[model samples]
Target: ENIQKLIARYPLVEDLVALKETTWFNPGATSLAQGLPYVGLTEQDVNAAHDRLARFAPYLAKAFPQTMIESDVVAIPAMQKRLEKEYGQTINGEMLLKKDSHLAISGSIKARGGIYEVLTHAEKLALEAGLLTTDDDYSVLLSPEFKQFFSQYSIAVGSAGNLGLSIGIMSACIGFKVTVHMSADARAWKKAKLRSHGVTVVEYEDPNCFFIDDENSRTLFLGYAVAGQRLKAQFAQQGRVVDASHPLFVYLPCGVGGGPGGVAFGLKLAFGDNVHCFFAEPTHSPCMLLGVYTGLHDAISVQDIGIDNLTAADGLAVGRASGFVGRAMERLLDGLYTLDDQTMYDMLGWLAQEEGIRLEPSALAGMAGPQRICASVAYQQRHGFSQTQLGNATHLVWATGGGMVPEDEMEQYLAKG
Candidate 1:
């Protein structure tokens, strides 16, 4: 049995009606055409299904570059080699933007979700304006200047490193307000990187909240959950439906869980069930994977959460899933998968060795997600997968962030002879 499935992705979520219906899932009447193959679940609730709502902030689609995969990211090898030689750590980059990958504005894989959510909100506002026949204009309703829905967006996510940066850079491009809730024990370098990006940073100062090897994760996870709740409330005003045939899924790197919860819930407004929103945590510290599969959501102690072998391999150092991310994932995600850290490490090494692609740990998380997915039994059945599941449809992996890993700092992750 093959392990990795041909993970599919909608390059552009803004094209939800066409993309979801024609490509992924079609709603109501039109879907009846093909019929049987459809996910066919009548009862659906985006917010209720996950118990965590989301925010609807329109974004300028042009903000993100372009979405491409496979060889598109292959060019990262040279970048990797350059980074390894200069920075000392090999960051795998070729796989995502190998040749001409234009992943929204954020650069890393996180662009897919970031830009897509905004497009979804934009679509809603567009429709609302048409029906209301208001001279005020729906476009105006979702404008970046609104500050409430899309403009000056404020998001709080837990970061061992890059995911926060991806959001920060993207927010800067779109002029959204950026706020990052980080753990107290997080590497000072990582925190400094976030600040350099011009993001407002909040550090958790609780001594009792350490999660094994990841001492600072607990505070970050809880912080992200609270912030996400606020974001979700903004979008709840329109209400939502959940059917697996939609365009919402967690294309993120998992560590403790808080960040994934917020992002997933944000997109839950429209395509709840149709989308496989889940925690794409790393295989390195699979406590959450074990927890999710075996139904052990209560193992909050750092001991049970794999704090020892956990790694900062792109925020893959976490062993236990945060309560908020875990609980939210159980409801929001169809399946939670553990990405391969070894392969990710190698891949990042590959990028640096071959293409001079120098990136931080979080970017590799996306590559690892696809690697693990293809290695899974479901992936094989889904895409008739062979080797790596490339035969499958559009696969959207989130290159969560790009912390400017300096030459000296990069040496700590991976430095070859």
Candidate 2:
């Protein structure tokens, strides 16, 4: 009866309640919604984040040589062909990988917000202590005196892999004492590497990737929101149109939902209804899908329904979704899908073999997205897209992580497929 009631409340729950592989087409998927949650986070808010990050450009370029003081978008064609062949679907639109996997600083998509949060906190502390002012060059923060002062503060976080690495690296690099709680599912090498960077690693018995809380979620969300405005600029620079005739579709991997939700929120603000954002998750731990469909959000876990929240996609191994992110993004998201661990391995190996791009398992979650949406009849009908419009569409797969994967580790991952 309860299950029936849930399905009645959210018709989509009928398909998503099961742990089996599923593609959920949200009936509530609409671009003309009356209002979106997270109303306080606006383009101005994301712009504010951008302004704050600009202050650290000189320091970032000097400390992380790969950044070169900027992070830009990349297009991948070979990987698109491989996915098209595997799925046996001619992706009407051009398929591109966002390549956040190669993002400098602490690699992976987490670098967008994780580093931002630490920097924001660091800047706040410095300003309050009168150690710095708006007129002073941010590069001065890299000085020994500032580092010594920063040493007095410490930060702690828990993660399966990437989030902790991003926060740990950024915090420690800025001279803040950092301790990362590495969950049992996190890679052994990641834990050891964090220690090598002089960041403390504490082991946890629970699963990785759970939501930390609302306050941290807000900070992380704002940091990620910065990407929306940046991507809009990238499109204009590349001569790509993101208006009504040329729709934009983005696929992001989900863990606790903060990372993707925040980015999706920003994208909506930047493109308005022109962009359709979707969340992809591991079938073994489809927490966000379950939560949004059942209206339970973080109150329920994948474990409650006997689905073990285990997967090779360590970054997406959360048992529960974020209540804050779920509620904030439920109405904004276009769709959600779940893929098995085997599919992730298959996609990871193919990208390596075809495109010479080596990404972690979790990063592969978005690789299957182009095929999923293109093949979905529901998506096609709801949008009422014409062939010309479909041809002009841009499908972006957000590669979350893999810039830090060791060559030996990558070979092992390739061997699994």
Candidate 3:
């Protein structure tokens, strides 16, 4: 097809194949990480979303009191050393983990946007119904009366895994009748777990008619944009600065790309040109790379180019990236890279061994980012970085899942090595 020709012209097909054989860097990946050209999003948008989320902190704290009121960003020196050992390279500076895997609620980075989206919808409806107001203590939503009222409404979504868990769990807890339609690509445990939570799980195989447009909604995008402001605070508390002199580089694993795209947008607003964001994907499901590279965006898919778009990373098994997000983020993103499923498994095992962490395989995808950037001479020269500047860079891996991973599943993933 013409799409395949476009991909092959740049030799992307070969690049993807080589990714499976070994870890490689895409030197030609361009960046507008410093300045976005056309997007209308700004810090005010993120601040409004943050304020909206604050009203519900009472409800979230009551629901998941075990975790902090907010998730954390932790410095993981041991894991960084482990990565340096495996890659035979010294990283620019400290490597950190944004512990969204331990995020309360449904776990995974999806908890950030997914829960916020559902809560946003719930608030809009309750206010429209005159059932609630901003002045109302959100804890009142926990009352039986609110649940009874909320039961009248319904929400639906489709997912490969974690987003469904997040949306399903939060929506159901708020008493919205939510059904999660999952594809064949999803993990078995995610379906069972949602079912246990009284959230309907509509398996994609038999009579898969009922589904929600979970592809890429603006609501979900705005919810994730709130992270940049908070991440700025987290870094400041840790005595870190992300100015031009001391840059911040964050790696986010992309599924349909909404989560990473929104977060990238937020990060840009928070740090201006001082932050660089990259997206990581599985070799089997490099939809974002294919989309951005060909400029077809989501008009074409990895499947159109003979990629099966199947991978062991349930969360990253998307065949298509979100065109809306792709366009919004094209100029903001620093680069894109793909790694094999085997590498993801290997990294997952390494993190667990060295850092006492247990993130899911997809969550490990972002771990390769710093190594990829460090390996690329083009990347270094493009930024015109001196040794001191490079030394001042802080690499952050956004761990996107594994809060709900079963013990046996964890062991099985580790055994994949």
Candidate 4:
């Protein structure tokens, strides 16, 4: 049976809505010429990943509860004044959002998956412990296992800034404590914003210096992976048909494949081999891109390569996939490219100036790819990719995260656009 059909042919849960019955995920909705058919996600892989995290972050299970959130679309949001117009969107971190904006919480897309995972875990714990009422804040089961690590137990996400803020706010919004790990190169105004939110900040002066190592990336990414897979399942359990392909091309703002692959694999469990995955590294740091043709996934976190001046776009890593999971993503990915920092920086300006989208350097990579993909007549011609295949296609480009820079820094961009 076709993957989508199999799910329809045999409903796993009682009274499950078949794929054919779903409006949002109808199998025959689009022409094959327009797009491929759906393939059910690898539930085993998703479940396996989920179990791993359940064991790994037992506290997350206790700290947060499963919460249903509506994710925003990226395209329609651009029309709003907050996101519209130039300078305002350029440095302030407002995304040109719309019905297409998928950012649910925090400025970037990670919030959708990030918040869902912890919340789901929390809810399960609640049911197990007979928690009836939890409102406004995260619910935690009072157990020795639920004790706070303070700086130790608190989340230490390495962000260009957006994901950290979202993680902090969402964690706080839900009830767990939050802390963030970031580069000292990040904007001061943004740093202050995080501090104001009470997010403990660990700034690394050295770009290569990583307090969160391969082990840490694995730990937290797995945690994210856990949350993602659970959301995919919980959606199914609730009779909502997840576009198993939803998370197809995860766009990482920077770093090796830390966030994208880790979370994508979680989606992989639900979507299976039905999609092609992609990664975007800052053209300045393209370690993964450089290694792609070389067949080596090597750089995890790097620094000191003069990443700041590339067209005013800051944030990205160019090294290899650095870890086993990253290597897995590198091996499985359908596409890879290095976006110029200057192009992204200028794009940061263009989205603000023309489209009214304020994406920090990292958040714009997904959109930037289309710009490059659209312009590369040579690459398109050689690869047999037609313009029609790309124009207005229903695609998910991760606005990974954002940093609302200071007005002083934004004034510099008043001329660039």
Number of the top-ranking candidate, with TM-score as the measure: 3
Q: Which structure is stronger by TM-score: 1 or 2?
A: 2
Residue clash pairs of candidate 2: none
**TM-score to true structure, per model:** 0.45, 0.91, 0.92, 0.56
Residue-by-residue lDDT tens digits, candidate 1, 1-417:
111111123232222212111111111111212321221121233222222112222223222233211113222334434434553433322222321122334444333333333333333444554532323333344334543443423444555444565555545443345676777877786567567656677889732121122222322232222322333343254242223321222345566565555444434433333334445555445545445544555453324322344545545566565554454345455455444445456666665666566555655655444334433555335533343223322234444444345667667556532
lDDT of 2 by residue, 1-417 (tens): 345565576665555455556777666766624436443466677777888888878778787777722355667778788878887987877777777788886678888878888888889889999999867888899899999988888887866567788888888888877888766766688887788778888887732122334233688898887888888888889988887788889999999898898889888888888898889999888889988877798887777666778788888988888787877787788888898888999999988888778888999888787888888877788878777887888998898888888888888788888
The CA lDDT of each predicted structure is: 0.41, 0.80, 0.80, 0.45
Which runs of model 3 end up more than 4 angstroms from their true locations? Answer: 1-4, 17-37, 67-69, 183-188, 204-212
Sort all candidates by TM-score, best to worst: 3, 2, 4, 1
What TM-score should be assigned to candidate 4?
Answer: 0.56
| Per-residue lDDT of candidate 4, residues 337-384 (tens digit) | 555555556666666766555556666665544333334455435434
RMSD vs true structure, all candidates: 14.4, 3.6, 3.2, 14.1
Candidate 1 regions with alpha-carbon error over 4 angstroms: 1-251, 265-278, 298-302, 305-309, 331-334, 339-341, 353-356, 375-392, 411-417
Which lDDT value does model 2 have at 42?
Answer: 60
Q: At residue 235, what lDDT does model 3 achieve?
A: 86
Global Cα lDDT for candidate 4:
0.45
RMSD of 2: 3.6
lDDT of 3 by residue, 1-417 (tens): 464466457666666644452233334434443345555565677777898888998887787676423568888899888889988977888899998888887778888888888888889888999989999989999999999988888888866577778888888889888888767666677777788779888766623222335465777887888888888899888899887678888899999998898888888888887788888899989888878776778897777777788788888888898897877777777788888888899889989889888988899988989888777777777777677877888999999888678898888888987
Taking the candidates one at a time, how many backbone clashes does each contain? 63, 0, 0, 39
